[PDB]
Design a protein around this ligand. Structure first.
Ligand SMILES: O[C@@H]1[C@@H](O)[C@H](O)OC[C@H]1O
Ligand SMILES: O[C@@H]1[C@@H](O)[C@H](O)OC[C@H]1O
Ligand SMILES: [Ca+2]
Ligand SMILES: [Ca+2]
Ligand SMILES: [Ca+2]
Ligand SMILES: [Ca+2]
Ligand SMILES: [Zn+2]
Length: 316
């Protein structure tokens, strides 16, 4: 909508207070004009029609329980935008400042979030398994990274290319969380997962097996569930990226860590320069090696660590 840019204030899913960029035109809309061609947040009103209504507020103060998921979807979309701009010189997910749209209050008790080819979509959770999922910045960045992947490598969402697609979203969801530096970790979804269970998460990058996911190619799931286990076998790639960044010895294979920022540059380059829609784990390895070579040289520690990490998880 057309209006004058202004700044509102509200509270997130987790009760934290934050300023949000809004637009004034009779009402104050969740429309952030400071980032590319806008970040737009919508209210699905407990239904499944998308995008719904552009969020409209009467006084620019968003402290109601009902507003919190919209506050966080709006705010964390901006953080993810900032990450890709400042770290990877990328303007929005299509690299040309496409408008980022997010709908919250999707359905009733919906325990998920997703990028639907055009926008992000967040359920409220049933209050038991999930609270509103936009409250997890790694969830938001996870979904928005899917838009980045769809516009670049285009990894088919099935089998190994689908698991790479999932791993990429877990990776950059985690790196965006570290970028904001609020209780960051190598776990996925901890902030919105099981409010009644402390210390758990949806997946673990540091130790995929913690939740039954493979941490080695030999343990990969080859059935048909989950489009061939795209959310399961991602553990194999998640573990390799954890090892690249943090180091460790895994099934007796030692990996020297190189840090988070270099992991991001290697995988972003791999994602945008070398991966294709049908790429498999082995081709991901080659992409990661060629990216680290481009960035740091064939005889670098970085290239060596990329090689050690994929050996650890059994990807040749
Ligand atoms: O109480 C809710 C209110 O916060 C919102 O603005 O409109 C829908 C209501 O359910
Ligand atoms: O507020 C209610 C909400 O809790 C539920 O998700 O759907 C029905 C609504 O009236
Ligand atoms: Ca208000
Ligand atoms: Ca965390
Ligand atoms: Ca996390
Ligand atoms: Ca929990
Ligand atoms: Zn995903």
């Amino acid at each position: 909508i057309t209006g004058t840019s202004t700044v509102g204030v509200g509270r997130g899913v987790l009760g934290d207070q934050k300023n949000i960029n809004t637009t004034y035109s009779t009402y104050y809309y969740l429309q952030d004009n400071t980032r590319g061609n806008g970040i737009f947040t919508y209210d699905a009103k407990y239904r499944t029609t998308l995008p719904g209504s552009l969020w409209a507020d009467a006084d620019n103060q968003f402290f109601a329980s009902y507003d919190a998921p919209a506050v966080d979807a709006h705010y964390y979309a901006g953080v993810t935008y900032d990450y890709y701009k400042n770290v990877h010189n990328r303007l929005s997910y299509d690299g040309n400042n496409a408008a980022i749209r997010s709908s919250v209050h999707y359905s009733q008790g919906y325990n998920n979030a997703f990028w639907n080819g055009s926008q992000m979509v967040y359920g409220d959770g049933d209050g038991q398994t999930f609270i509103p999922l936009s409250g997890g910045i790694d969830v938001v960045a996870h979904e928005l990274t899917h838009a980045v992947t769809d516009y670049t490598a285009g990894l088919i969402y099935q089998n190994e290319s689908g698991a790479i697609n999932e791993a990429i979203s877990d990776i950059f969801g985690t790196l965006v969380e570290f970028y904001a530096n609020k209780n960051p970790d190598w776990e996925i979804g901890e902030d919105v997962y099981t409010p009644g269970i402390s210390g758990d998460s949806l997946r673990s990058m540091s130790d995929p097996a913690k939740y039954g996911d493979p941490d080695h190619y030999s343990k990969r799931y080859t059935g048909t569930q989950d489009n061939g286990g795209v959310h399961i076998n991602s553990g194999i790639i998640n573990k390799a990226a954890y090892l690249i960044s943090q180091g460790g010895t895994h099934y007796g294979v030692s990996v020297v860590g190189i840090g988070r920022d270099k992991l991001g540059k290697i995988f972003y380059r791999a994602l945008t320069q070398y991966l294709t829609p049908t790429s498999n784990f082995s081709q991901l390895r080659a992409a990661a090696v060629q990216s680290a070579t481009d960035l740091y040289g064939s005889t670098s520690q970085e290239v060596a660590s990329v090689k050690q990490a994929f050996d650890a998880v059994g990807v040749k």
